Amino acid sequence: QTIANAEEEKTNVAAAEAEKISKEATEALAEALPALRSAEAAVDCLKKPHVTEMKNLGSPPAGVIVTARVVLILFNQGITLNDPDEKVWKKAVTFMNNPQAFIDKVKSFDGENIEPNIIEQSNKIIQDPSKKFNEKDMAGQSYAASKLCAWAVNIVTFNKIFKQVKPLQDAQKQANEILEEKKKELAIVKQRV
């Protein structure tokens, strides 16, 4: 009885520690949802107007044919950043040729992480100090653009966060499951004692 009592105490302490780790992980999880939600709220920035410009723009400003890269990139339409501008722009029109079509895609196309090759190429540009693309520095260029990129930036930050939350949720769920199992065991041995 005294051995089983000592065993029951050790399992009760281990369960209490697991429950504290579980609480810290749920707090980290609760920071990592505002994470997603913040970005998700900042994902509808792009609208049915701003695209129908880009279609009709026909001619090009310089910085808008950087927005037109990330765009193709994320949608995984190939060609990367090696091909010239002018031929990149004839690839960022064909999409928009139906505005309602496009906005349709953007809401759906979300997926979760989409593709881990792409996000490098898109991260490259954003992580380049040169060629602007902050989203303000865009505006000045061809306004619309400012919206398109703002989203495109807000998507990247999402992906980056949606790689933080996945691990954090996984670590949370494991810690929760162990804490519950340890508590049930602790309850049973306490009853036996």
Q: At what angle do helices 144-192 and 64-75 cross, to 10 degrees?
A: 40
Measure CA 54 to chain center.
25
- Residue 147, both tokens: 């919206």
Whole-number Å distance between alpha carbons of 139 and 145:
7
CB atoms under 10 Å from CB of 19, counted, come to: 16
CB atoms under 10 Å from CB of 108, counted, come to: 8
Residue 85 main-chain phi, psi, to 5 deg: -60, -80
Do residues 143 and 41 touch, judged by C-beta distance below 8 A?
Answer: no
CB atoms under 10 Å from CB of 33, counted, come to: 14
Cβ burial 56-76 (10 Å sphere, 16+ → b, else e):
ebeebeebbbbbbbbbbbbbe
DSSP 8-state code for residue 94: T
Whole-number Å distance between alpha carbons of 15 and 182:
5
Do residues 158 and 43 touch, judged by C-beta distance below 8 A?
Answer: yes
- Residue 97, both tokens: 């040729």
Method by which the model was determined: cryo-EM
